From a paper:
Respiratory complex I is a proton-pumping oxidoreductase key to bioenergetic metabolism.
We identify a helix-locked state in which an N-terminal α-helix on the NDUFS4 subunit wedges between the peripheral and membrane arms. In the helix-locked state, the C-terminal loop of NDUFA9 binds atop the TMH1-2ND3 loop, trapping R50ND3 to the surface of ND1, thereby holding the loop in place like a latch. In the helix-locked state, multiple hydrogen bonding and salt bridging interactions were seen between the TMH1-2ND3 loop and ND1. First, in the helix-locked state, the angle between the PA and MA is not consistent with either the open states of Y. lipolytica or mammalian CIs but the active site loops are fully ordered and buried by the NDUFA9 latch. The presence of the NDUFA9 latch holding the TMH1-2ND3 loop down in the helix-locked state may block conformational changes in TMH1-2ND3, suggesting that it is a resting state incapable of turnover.
Numbering used by the authors:
A (entry chain S8): 32 to 109
B (entry chain AN): 3 to 71
C (entry chain A1): 1 to 70
D (entry chain S2): 105 to 156
E (entry chain 6): 1 to 174
F (entry chain 4L): 1 to 96
G (entry chain 3): 1 to 117
H (entry chain 1): 1 to 315
Write the structure that this text describes.
Amino acid sequence: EPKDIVEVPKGYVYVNNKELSMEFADITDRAASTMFFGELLRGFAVTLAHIFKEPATINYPFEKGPLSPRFRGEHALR
Amino acid sequence: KFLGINRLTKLFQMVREAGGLKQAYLKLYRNDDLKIGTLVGIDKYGNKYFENPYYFYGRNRWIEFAPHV
Amino acid sequence: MWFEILPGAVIITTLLSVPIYAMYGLDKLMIGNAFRRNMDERFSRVMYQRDFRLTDNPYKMNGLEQIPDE
Amino acid sequence: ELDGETVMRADPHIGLLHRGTEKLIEYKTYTQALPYFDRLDYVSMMCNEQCY
Amino acid sequence: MIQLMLYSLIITTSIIFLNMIHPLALGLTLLIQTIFVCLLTGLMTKSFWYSYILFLIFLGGMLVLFIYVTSLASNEMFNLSMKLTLFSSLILIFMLILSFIMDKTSSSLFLMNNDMQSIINMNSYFMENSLSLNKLYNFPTNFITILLMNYLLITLIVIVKITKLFKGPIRMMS
Amino acid sequence: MIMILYWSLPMILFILGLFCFVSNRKHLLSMLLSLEFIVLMLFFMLFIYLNMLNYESYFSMMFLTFSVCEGALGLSILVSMIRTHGNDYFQSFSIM
Amino acid sequence: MFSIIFIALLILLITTIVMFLASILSKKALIDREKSSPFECGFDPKSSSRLPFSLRFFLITIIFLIFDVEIALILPMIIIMKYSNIMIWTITSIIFILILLIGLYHEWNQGMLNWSN
Amino acid sequence: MFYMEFILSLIGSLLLIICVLVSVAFLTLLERKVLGYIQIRKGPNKVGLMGIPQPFCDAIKLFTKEQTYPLLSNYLSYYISPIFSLFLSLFVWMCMPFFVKLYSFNLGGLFFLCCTSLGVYTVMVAGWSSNSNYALLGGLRAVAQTISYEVSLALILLSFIFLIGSYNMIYFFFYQVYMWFLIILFPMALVWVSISLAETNRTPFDFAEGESELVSGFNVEYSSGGFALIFMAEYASILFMSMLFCVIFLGCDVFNLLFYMKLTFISFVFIWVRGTLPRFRYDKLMYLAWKCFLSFSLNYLLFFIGFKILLFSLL
Amino acid sequence: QQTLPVAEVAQNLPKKGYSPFGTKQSSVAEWSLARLDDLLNWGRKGSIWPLTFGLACCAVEMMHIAAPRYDMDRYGVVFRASPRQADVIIVAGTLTNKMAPALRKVYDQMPEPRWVISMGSCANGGGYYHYSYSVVRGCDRIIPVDIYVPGCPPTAEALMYGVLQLQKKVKRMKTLQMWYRK
Amino acid sequence: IYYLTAKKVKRDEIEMRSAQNVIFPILVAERDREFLRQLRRNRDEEAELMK
Amino acid sequence: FEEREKMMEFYERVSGARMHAAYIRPGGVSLDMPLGLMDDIYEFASKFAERLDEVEDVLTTNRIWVQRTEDIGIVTAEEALNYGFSGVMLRGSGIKWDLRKQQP
Ligand SMILES: COC1=C(OC)C(=O)C(C/C=C(\C)CC/C=C(\C)CC/C=C(\C)CC/C=C(\C)CC/C=C(/C)CC/C=C(\C)CC/C=C(\C)CC/C=C(\C)CC/C=C(\C)CCC=C(C)C)=C(C)C1=O
Ligand SMILES: CCCCCCCCCCCCCCCCCC(=O)OC[C@H](COP(=O)([O-])OCC[N+](C)(C)C)OC(=O)CCCCCCCCCCCCCCCCC
Ligand SMILES: CCCCCCCCCCCCCCCCCC(=O)OC[C@H](COP(=O)(O)OCCN)OC(=O)CCCCCCCCCCCCCCCCC
Ligand SMILES: CCCCCCCCCC(=O)OC[C@H](COP(=O)(O)OCCC(C)C)OC(=O)CCCCCCC
Ligand code: SF4
């Protein structure tokens, strides 16, 4: 586990606070992810997964979006 | 057959329910998606309202317009 | 959903397959050989000069019927 | 003001979407002045209604 | 016929190049000049290697020179002249007529092409750029290549020394 | 006649490039472009000489290297004008 | 190469006919005074684009030119390996690439590959 | 030379030009459909039958809208540059390795480098001649981009050539009869994909036509035909480097439909990188193609020099 | 005022067809020019390119036709940054006194044909800031407007209703038949 | 696998070069006979033209 | 923005307008929430963690996003206090200040 630069208080969360590990295993892991594009391949994998999803598009005007009975539109005189 | 051949069977059922290959072509040209669903209603002006809860919310209920337009 | 990407891709697959295969017909209509003679090496060019010297068609081949009986 | 691609002096000019809101709030009732605050900040709205 | 056409085009573009004040007119004129010079150089050698090499060289050079156009003399007026257009058109049509009425065997180059070499030449049957470029990496003249590596390193050291990067960017009235 | 029918043309174009190099122009970069043109015509004449001989065209890249380093020297001199002057006007430089 | 000249002239001819057909079939409306003006994100420019531009990568451009003529001497030795002395070819090739690595790493050490700023 | 050749070379070149142009149109359709499907949304579906004649909608409109006659521009240089951009982007396609003799390009790599250098010349001429500040900034970004990637593109090509021994790309077919070169050259599969996006001015390297840093880049003053030929020139460059990824890294055979399926897949990869990764800065592009890509190219060139001397002694 | 017809009357009527100019025009040249105009309006009502303008809150709704519920790229509609590469400018938001020459310059540099969609109450008639000093009373008095989307935030359904009504306006737009009858 | 592929390509290249080496002597024999015939024709034509 | 359109659908459900709700008023709220909003908001809040996980898998780890964001636009804390900063621009510079906790 990477160490913390500043000790966090109770009820607070510090982002970008973890020191980078200088041991050989973490340096080799980040080096392999550098020269072999590990996070780029992970982002491409997530994107290729969301290609296979169902679209959220609705066929306007045959299909119309959900609404509410309280909806505010054209004024009318009853 | 775990890859979607039953979906091809459903597509062929959609084609036979549409009224033929020419009628399915005409329905796919007019309505940009080809779908099946139970006929709920027919409004005085001649439009037809279908509802199928199998689809995504927002595409459950749709209208097929009057054939004279 | 995702299969609608395949209309619009096969047309790129088919039409870019057009200018090769059509010549694989269009040579055979007029050359008679589906592969016209390559000119990368000097020896192939010299032997093409030899074929075009022997016949007006370099792709028409002189077989053993050219050789006289003796 | 740019020397090449890098900036030397970036000066913002605003008032291009200045609508005279506060002078207009001075002329309305508080109930009528409440829909102004939806149009102060555009993408958080119930926060501005909460503040007013 | 194509060689005499390249002669006429090179003559006309050289007349155009001698008369252009604006650096971009000189750049476009030397673009079409290096295109025509690259084709003409190709006609003389058995292979087409050094035309390609010269085109990479003269497209790597003027790519930098346009940045110096946009940094120094970016604002300068173009002046089209009807006299230069009429002169170039009359000289161009005159040399196309003169090249059409000329015997092209006498005006052809005497330098030997890959097919102008005889059949008995066994060195012509090899790969087309092997024996031409061999002496760059052979024993008598590898040391000239060594000298060129060291010369390019010394050139880069000179460029770094007399373009001080820490003095700032370059423009007009810096 | 033989000197006239062959290789008389790039002498004329080299003379025109030399006259373009020494003409009264406002900027130094036009002289750099005229240098690139006389590199082109020297390449033409050297290429005629190296193609009378059979397999000695390897030298034609060395002339390109020395000419590109000449152009790089001229470009770095054009940078060094900005270190002292604000311009590349040839009238702005010292005549003595 | 004579066929490449003719097909390059034909591609240039076809593209000029395509551009002239785009110009002929274009909608011909009258030219307004401020329609022709440069865009400049909807406001007045205050300066022409012929104003001199600051160059922060002059050293990188001249190093690019030097490295490109260095590229022009690498491209022969694909062919020269099968027809030369192997010892001389390896001494020249490994010494070429190591001298390029010395030059590039030395200018990386000086920081001359960073833009002036 | 036989008369029929010239006729069949002319016919095959013209058929190739027409098929590359219609494939550019359907490549715009493919990008607009899968790039929507990169996100949740759909592609073009309403117009025509199922969005198939949508590039015809895009081509009818751009060939009829009013031609811009800009005020401060040099119009005689502004009109000619997209013509030359499309001319070189279709002229580079004569380098395609045909198994029939289309053209005997013995020096196809040098021809590819020449047309690659000339396409960015048309881009930077069109950027200057518009006389707009965003157009000049996009043009200078394109010049800095090509100065960044040019020597890296050349040395990486040399390493592939070493595995071949000749500059003729049809000799890529004989050396790939047992396997593809994606096994050996996977780090330059990544590096050549990085260079090929910088070649075609595509995301993550899209500084010549920026939609957020600049306003449309150098295309800011081009409309209704000039923009059309610039756009087809860019997409024909995308098709050409997709083809060159299929030639070098994959099978160089052209008599199989799997080659064109692979070319459509590499074009889908070209759309796929744009829909995932954010754009760089061209400062970081110049610091990438000079300190990482060039050093790796020289080092792995040394590796291939040693491997080719090792292989030559064993033969 | 007429209503939608009853289904018996609708069955009595025939199909309208795609062409708004009718099937036949009793002349070969008129029929050829009408079909060329039909092809041109199909190419023009397909893929109108709106302009990245976005003055105010109504713009946030403009990304809800970008957002994958409504998908404006399904219709051919796709945003372009430059006004030269745009058919439509969606004036959507408050048009103030400082944005009068900005909107006039961006509209004038956009090339013909030009159709402007006025989205939102501020762009239509000033709206909730109508009686203020700085707000221009609608965008009609500077630039022409072809489509008036009426909601203050329109629903993205109601914005694509304006976009589809603009497509129907381009479908009824006639220039070659006008040239034959001028 | 590339070493095996290079062995196959070298075998094909050596077979093509062997075919070139076995075809060439007939071609150069025809070349020298036609060369001597054309040299005799050129020497006769130069004597006819320059009289 | 698919999830953002789901929340504007929730806004339209509770107030009747998708964006400008006019809902929170002096003296409470104008209307009670309709029945069944709990299940819809709960289903959305159950899925939104996975949606943020996918968005962070694309954006956060990438080298281009890091090179385009990190060590860029660094503002010191005394400049943040002297120039009257508030919110995230205070919280991004190390200053522990949230108005929801200090003055609730
Ligand atoms: C918070 O604050 C902010 C605001 O406040 C609230 C704002 O308001 C705004 C402003 C924002 C808005 C107003 C809306 C938000 C903007 C967006 C969501 C825009 C982002 C979306 C995109 C950029 C779309 C996604 C990208 C895609 C899909 C890429 C493709 C896009 C295109 C435009 C490509 C289409 C172009 C084409 C096809 C060119 C046409 C050319 C052709 C078709 C030519 C081809 C030719 C052929 C095929 C045939 C030719 C054949 C020939 C010539 C030969 C044939 C010969 C024969 C003989 C047959 C912002 C930013 C903001 O932050
Ligand atoms: C079916 C296919 C699916 C995948 C398709 C897509 C393929 C993958 C993506 C292709 C390109 C995508 C667009 C371009 C992205 C460019 C990203 C980029 O370069 O970012 C810069 C970043 C910068 O690195 P950084 O992000 O760490 O930055 C910090 C470091 N400084 C600031 C100093 C640079 O990454 C790199 O440059 C990484 C190196 C890239 C080149 C690869 C070198 C390999 C070296 C040889 C390895 C040897 C191993 C050991 C051998 C031992 C032998 C004995
Ligand atoms: C490698 C580097 C090479 C460098 C050298 C290249 C040289 C190429 C040749 C150059 C020739 C130049 C000729 C120039 C003539 C026109 C000059 C001009 O400037 O025209 C201006 C005109 C309108 O522009 P203007 O109103 O001046 O607006 C600018 C205001 N700032 O502009 C226009 O109207 C635009 C031009 C329209 C041209 C139309 C021509 C008539 C139609 C021809 C037939 C088309 C047939 C199509 C169908 C064919 C079917 C088979
Ligand atoms: C308008 C011209 C634009 C610039 C074209 C540059 C082409 C590459 C540079 C070069 O010299 O290439 C040598 C090559 C030499 O040919 P190759 O060696 O490529 O192929 C042999 C040729 C029939 C075996 C393949 O020539 C060309 O590319 C022809 C250029 C035609 C230009 C026409 C207009 C004058
Ligand atoms: S019309 Fe309504 S939603 Fe649109 S900008 Fe004005 S106040 Fe905002």
